[PDB]
Structures are given as C-alpha cells and as structure tokens.
C-alpha cells in the first residue's frame, strides 16, 4: 500500500532546512521520501509519478519558499498533486509549509493561496509539535520509533569526502643529523700562562674555561697569533678523551661525570656554529633568546635561489626569512632549526620598534601555508651549505664537524583525501 509521506523541496536551490526535518521525521516514526535523501541516481521525474505519487504516497508536504515561482519543478509537482487530489477527492492533501518572510499576499503566486498551512516562521519546534498532533488526529499510520535507523542513515549518507583512507605519504622533519665528530676532546693546562682577567670568547676558535681542564677541540698551539707567550709549555701534561666513549655515556671519572661533559660538548658546538656564521655573507638580528640569521637584499641573484623567494617587499617595508639553530643531543645529535621573519625599512636598516615588528610579522605571515614554509626552509638550509652534500663547521686548524643538509624523513599508514581545497 501507500505509507510514504512525500515532502517536496528545492534540492538544487540552496536549502538546508529539509535535511534535519526529514531526519527527525524518520526518527520519530513514519517513513519519509525525499530527493536529497536518496541522492544515488540521476533521472528526471519518471520513477516518482510512476510509483510513489500514484501508488506509494499517503500525504504531501509541499513547502513554499520565496523562489518557488521561478522553479518549474515545484509547479509541475503541484500540478500532479492537484491531479491526484481531484482523483481521491481529499482536501487535506496539500499543506503549504511556509518558512521565509518576504511572501506577501499582494505579491504571491495566484494558485498557492488556495489553502492555509502550519507556520514555521516563528519557531519550528512548535511547527514540529503541531504537525505531529495534526498527523495524530487524522489517524496517519506510523511505526514505533526506531531512532537507530535515523542515526545509521545519517552516518551513511554524509560520508563522501570524509573519514580516512589507506593512502601512503611521507613527511620531512625540522631536524638535521650529525655525521661526524673530532676524534678526541682535549683539556689543556696553562696556569701561569693565562691572564686571569681577559675574556675567552674572543679567541678565533671555540674554547671555554674549567677549573684546570681548559676545554678545546684543537691542538695546544693554535692561539699563538692571537696572544703571545705560549711556546714555553709542553704538551705532555695535556689530557685527551675519546669522543665515542663520552658520547656513549660510558666515560666517567671522579672530577667530571657524563652529563656535565655532554653539556660541555653542546656548548662547544653551539659556539662553533655561532662563530662559523661570521663568514657566510649574512647578517644577524638580536632577540631575547639566541640570535637569528637573516640575508641581505641584492646580494642574492634577483632575490631568488633556485626559483624560490627569500627576500620580498610588503607595501613599504622589506621582509627577510631568517633562521635560528640550537644543538641537541639526547635522541641523536641534531640541530633545532626555527624560522622567523625580519623586517627592514629599505633593506639595509632595520625597523626600530618591536610592536610594529610584531604587527608586520602577523600581517605578512597571515597567508603562508605548509608548502611555502617547507620550501623556504629547505632552500635556505641548502644555500647556507658550502658543499653540495654537507656543511663544515670549522672548530680548529684542521678539525671540523660535518652536518648534512637532508632532514629526517618519516612516513605512516593512515591518510585522507588531499584535494579538499576549501
């Protein structure tokens, strides 16, 4: 027999009110037939009149929006509806649901004013309840409510372009590995040599002061030009410790433990990197934390390095992509690399106030995304390299550390449908 409560709606026209109404109607009992619900086939009004209107429909719920006059589909549906209304001679067959406001009786379709219907303009919960009681008073058949069916249907229909898939993908990290180290770390004794007032950071090579163990990665005679009175000392009293043993954590003596030694090495590599950035034709900017390194304008070929942008202009100022680094040692010897944006008033002189710096950083970085960040970081790291495969951090006369320019690569299993676009 007929049990489906057909309700008409403007599927192509932008409408989002029929979906939840139909969902709660089917979850509240009787079945509902909709065009937007059964969106799995493409055909004109052929099966509708063939099956439901003629034989498989009890009531109709023709809605009445503002743009119903222009749409010919609703007019054809209303014509078929009045034909069947004449066929069964039942007046209560067409209830013109009204939602919008601009429908004026003076300017309205000449045929829709035949009847009056429940009003959904005020609040459609009251319309829901009055529709339910009107349906009850006319002995409309309805099955006992099984809302799990509605939940399952909602899960099924709204699934395209969602959820996860099994596609494979790869990611590149923000770290950079360390592939070499000097063979041994040295501690020298100078005592009577070194003046007890002058600063040690000014040396051409990184070296820091301990109680007696003057820490170095180079020989015991490499500071002669910087400073005199060093040839009256013997190298037999110096101390050397293997790098593999200290790195493995096995080395330990009474005076020094392992963690202090690892911290010493981290400080050494940090200072070495900071010193090495002196002769790479770049400038530096000072922050609350460690320095940032930015590139000058014009020094690079038409502001690009292998078809990529690093220095640009924003309305009046100029923006540069600067980086900062910090050595880490726990999981593997690597370098944290962080990206910042530096602003200048013409390209040679930096804007002074920090507040406008922050505002300009926000304004410029508003509309950047994953690809741009990754590309710029990779390009800057590659350009900073002095070799086609790695980077040499110069620690001594002939000793150096090697850092590769290929970040760690990860990959997983789960993924999604990438071209979401919007």
């Amino acid at each position: 027999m007929r049990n489906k409560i057909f309700i008409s709606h403007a599927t192509p026209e932008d409408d989002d009110f029929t979906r939840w109404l139909s969902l709660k109607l089917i979850g509240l009992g009787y079945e509902v037939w909709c065009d937007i619900l059964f969106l799995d086939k493409g055909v004109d009004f052929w099966s509708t009149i063939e099956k439901e209107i003629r034989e498989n429909t009890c009531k109709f719920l023709i809605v009445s929006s503002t743009a119903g006059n222009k749409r010919e589909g609703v007019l054809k549906e209303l014509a078929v509806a009045t034909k069947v209304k004449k066929h069964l001679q039942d007046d209560m067959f067409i209830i013109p649901l009204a939602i919008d406001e601009n429908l004026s009786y003076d300017d309205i379709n000449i045929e829709i004013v035949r009847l009056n219907a429940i009003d959904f303009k005020k609040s459609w919960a009251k319309g829901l309840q009055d529709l339910l009681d009107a349906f009850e008073k006319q002995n409309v058949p309805k099955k006992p409510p099984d809302h799990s069916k509605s939940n399952l249907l909602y899960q099924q229909i709204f699934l395209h372009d969602k959820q996860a898939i099994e596609k494979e993908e790869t990611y590149d990290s923000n770290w950079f590995p360390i592939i070499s180290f000097p063979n041994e770390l040295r501690f020298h004794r100078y005592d009577w040599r070194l003046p007890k007032q002058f600063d040690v950071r000014t040396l051409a090579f990184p070296a820091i002061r301990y109680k007696e163990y003057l820490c170095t990665f180079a020989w015991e005679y490499d500071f002669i030009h910087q400073l005199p009175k060093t040839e009256t000392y013997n190298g037999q009293e110096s101390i050397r410790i293997s790098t593999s043993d200290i790195l493995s954590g096995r080395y330990d003596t009474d005076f020094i433990r392992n963690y202090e030694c690892q911290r010493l090495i981290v400080q050494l590599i940090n200072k070495a990197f900071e010193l090495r950035m002196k002769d790479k034709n770049v400038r530096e900017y000072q922050m609350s934390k460690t320095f940032a390194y930015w590139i000058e304008k014009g020094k690079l070929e038409k502001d690009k390095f292998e078809k990529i942008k690093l220095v640009g202009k924003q309305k009046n100022k100029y923006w540069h992509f600067g980086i900062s680094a910090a050595g880490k040692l726990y999981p593997s010897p690597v370098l944290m690399v962080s990206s910042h944006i530096i602003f200048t008033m013409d390209g040679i002189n930096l804007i002074k106030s920090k507040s406008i710096q922050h505002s300009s950083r926000r304004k410029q970085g508003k509309n950047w995304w994953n690809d741009k960040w990754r590309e710029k970081l990779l390009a800057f790291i590659r350009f900073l390299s002095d070799d086609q495969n790695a980077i040499y951090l110069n620690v001594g006369s002939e000793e150096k550390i090697l850092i590769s320019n290929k970040p760690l690569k990860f990959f997983g299993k789960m993924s999604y449908v990438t071209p979401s676009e919007v």
Partner: protein, 451 residues
C-alpha cells in the same frame, strides 16, 4: 625507518544512548541528557543594557545562518536543540541609574576604585537575593570603561553566597551598531554569528543546571587527577604555591566531574615542588572522595602535571596508597619544536598521529586537520605536545589513548576538540579566582561558580 602509530578517534554520548563525534551535530540531532525546563533569569545594568539584552534574547529564537555550513554548522533555534523556554517576559531587572560618580577614578589608587565598583554590583546582587520574593537562576551583569581585575574580584567576593553569574559586554551583543565611531571598526561577526549564538546558548544552559553531554569510553575503577601551581607574589612573602586539583570518576551509573581544592602553600621562591606533609592531606582527601562515593577504594589513579616530581614528595604519596593502587604520574609539556611537513600539497598533518621515541617519552598530535570538518584546527603547521611517564609502571600507548580521549570535554565552549586536557585547564581556571582574595575557608567545589 621509524613509523607513526595511529589512534582511532573516540566518541561521545548524547540523549537516548546514542553516539556521535561533533557536539554541535549531535545536539542538533538528538538532544541533551537530562531534562530541565526553567531558565528564570535576572539582569543588572543600565536601561540600554536591558534593552540590548532583550533584543538579543528575542533574536536568538530564529534560525541563524553561517557562511560555511560544512565547517561551522547551523543553529536552528533554542526551543529545538534544548527543548526549554528562555523568553524576555520572565526577567527581573534592577537599575544602576546614573550614579556613576566613581568615574573620576579618585584620580589615584585604582585598587579602591575596583573595590568600590565591584562592591556596588555585589551589594545589589546580595540584597536582591536576600530580600526579593521572585526566584532567579542566573544573573547576567552588563558592563559598558577600563579595568583590570574586575572578573576575578567579582567571582571571588561572591563565592560564599554561591550564586551563579555570567559577565557580558553590550559591545559583543550589539556589535551591529557599535561600529567605527570615528573610522575604527571594532567587531564583525557576520562570518561567525551562528557560532557565537551556539557558544552563548551552551554556556547559559550549562550554568542553568543541565548536562549537555558526557563521555562514554571510560574504564571502571580508574580515577584521574590534575595539578598546577600558581604564582602569588602581591604580598611581600614568597608564596609561589597554589595547588588545586580536579577529579573525573565513573560512578556506578553515571560520571562525576568536580574539583578538589584548598590552597596549599609553600615557602621558598622557586621551589615549585610540594612539602612532604602537605601532599598527604591532598592525596587523603582525593582518595576519600572516591571512597565515600563508590563505597570502595579505587583500583588505579592517574596524576597529570606540567612538572616532574622529586623523590621525597613522591615517596610521601606512597604512605597513603591503601593496598596496591598505582599512582602513575604523567608530565605534559607544550614547547618542543618538531614541526612535521607534508611532502606535497598544501594541507598539514592530520590529527591523531603519535610518535614514540622510547617506552616513556612520546610526541602526541592533538591539533591537526579534521577530514570531517574539511578544515584545520591550527592556523599554521601544528606543533605536538610532549608526554612523559615520570614515575610508576604502565603502558605508554594506553596513556596516549586516554589523554587523547580526555580532550573532548570543554563545557565552556562548543568546539570539536581542545588542544590540552581539560583536567589541567580547569585548575588554572580556578586558581586565579581563588588567589584574587584569600579570605575564604572551605569554598564550594562545584563548577558553576568558578567558570
């Protein structure tokens, strides 16, 4: 090559014992859990505030549009989602008139300015509650120009009387006309308005005394806890210690989410740990709550924190463990640079992926790209959170799944997910309110008052 482990997204409960993921769609489809039906409300403010509140209140009934319904869903109406009544014909209103003499700020010592400004509203509310015959559920105070600690003091001085209160500014409600007065536009909610209505309605309904939704993937006999220290240095003495906690328990039938609070103090400037004697009382009270509620001692207890535990203060915790309960402690950190970049495209890594460096430490991605919403939660490429099992023995992946599931309970908002677990968030939420004034003993441990 090192892989990434994936964790399935949990699900939350709704009315009629149904399951969904996004709270907005579930609420719009199913409904809240318990049935309350009274939102008798009262306001306090000038005439303009009253008329603006009335206008917004009757506006909220109609359906509201959003520009991208795929990302931010619809709001059909208050009577539909909640099944309650909230009108403008059942309100009580008390004038503030144009006294306004405090506006000269006394030209100095703004502390007493804040004192007097908060005192006016506090005395009005107290007198109205004590003398008036009518019954009121929540109060919406409307304030028009520059102040610092109004919010903390207002809720601090009203804690004893235990009256819920919500604070609103008519600039937010009436952003349509509060546009550029000289060429400086301020707000524009055209792209968002439905979201604003959603959030305000959810907050008001929760304050009224209703439970919108609850989690449904908890394990029986398992407790939870939070911890955070607050800095109080307005007085000369170095105090540095304000330890609160929250509790999320599985009752015999439902759930329980409350706070265990009493300001525990500590000398010394930078000693962020806890004294051996004081920890005993905190653990004893936390244990006793479950013992009295569930007629038995808990089986497993998890402690969450943002700092590590020393040896002696943790050993003090062991003397209170009844028979064998394991007090596994977890430390969460939110600053470690491991930005992972997708190889190709323009969309970042999607949430749910975790990285394990060892049996203790882990990186968890609570923020990413949600395929269902077809949008990202973070503006730029997201950064993960570091999770470390400090003391005790447990399984790392299970802890990861539990903390991931704990991020979907934020009753102050209606967002798909939260960056950090709520158990940490609410302790910090109540810490400043408690430390605004130290003249309370045995404060309420509910949630309507502090939020």
């Amino acid at each position: 090559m090192k892989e990434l482990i994936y964790i399935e997204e949990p699900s939350i409960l709704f009315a009629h014992g149904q399951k969904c993921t996004d709270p907005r769609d579930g609420l719009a489809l199913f409904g809240p859990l318990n049935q309350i039906y009274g939102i008798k409300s009262g306001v306090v403010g000038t005439q303009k505030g009253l008329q603006i509140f009335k206008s917004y209140l009757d506006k909220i009934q109609k359906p509201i549009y959003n520009h991208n319904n795929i990302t931010r869903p619809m709001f059909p109406g208050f009577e539909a989602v909640f099944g309650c009544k909230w009108e403008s014909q059942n309100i009580v209103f008390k004038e503030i008139t144009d006294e306004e003499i405090r506006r000269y700020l006394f030209n100095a010592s703004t502390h007493k300015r804040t004192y007097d400004l908060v005192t006016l509203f506090n005395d009005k509310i107290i007198t109205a509650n004590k003398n008036d015959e009518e019954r009121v559920d929540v109060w919406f105070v409307i304030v028009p120009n520059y102040d610092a600690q109004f919010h903390d003091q207002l809720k601090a001085r009203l804690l004893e009387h235990t009256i819920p209160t919500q604070i609103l500014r008519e600039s937010t409600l009436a952003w349509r006309d509060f546009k550029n007065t000289f060429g400086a536009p301020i707000r524009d909610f055209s792209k968002i308005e439905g979201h604003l209505a959603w959030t305000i309605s959810t907050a008001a309904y929760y304050k009224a005394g209703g439970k919108p939704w609850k989690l449904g993937d908890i394990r029986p006999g398992v407790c939870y806890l939070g911890l955070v220290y607050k800095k109080i240095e307005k007085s000369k003495n170095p105090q540095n210690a304000c330890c609160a906690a929250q509790m999320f328990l599985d009752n015999g039938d439902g759930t329980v989410f409350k706070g265990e609070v009493g300001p525990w103090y500590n000398p010394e400037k930078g000693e962020y740990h806890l004294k051996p004697k004081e920890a005993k009382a905190l653990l004893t009270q936390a244990l006793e709550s479950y013992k009295e509620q569930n007629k038995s001692y808990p089986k497993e207890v998890f402690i969450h924190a943002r700092t590590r535990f020393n040896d002696e203060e943790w050993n003090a915790f062991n003397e209170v463990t009844p028979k064998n309960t394991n007090l596994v402690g977890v430390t969460i950190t939110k600053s470690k640079p491991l930005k992972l970049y997708k190889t190709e495209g323009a969309f970042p890594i999607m949430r749910g992926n975790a990285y394990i460096v060892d049996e203790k430490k882990a990186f968890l991605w609570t923020l990413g790209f949600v395929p269902k919403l077809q949008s990202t939660l973070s503006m730029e490429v997201p950064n993960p959170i570091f999770i470390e099992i400090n003391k005790g023995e447990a399984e790392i992946q299970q802890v990861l799944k539990d903390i991931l599931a704990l991020t979907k309970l934020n009753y102050n908002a209606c967002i798909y997910a939260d960056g950090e677990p709520v158990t940490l968030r609410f302790a910090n939420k109540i810490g400043e309110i408690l430390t605004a004034s130290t003249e309370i003993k045995t404060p309420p441990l509910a949630f309507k008052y502090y939020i």
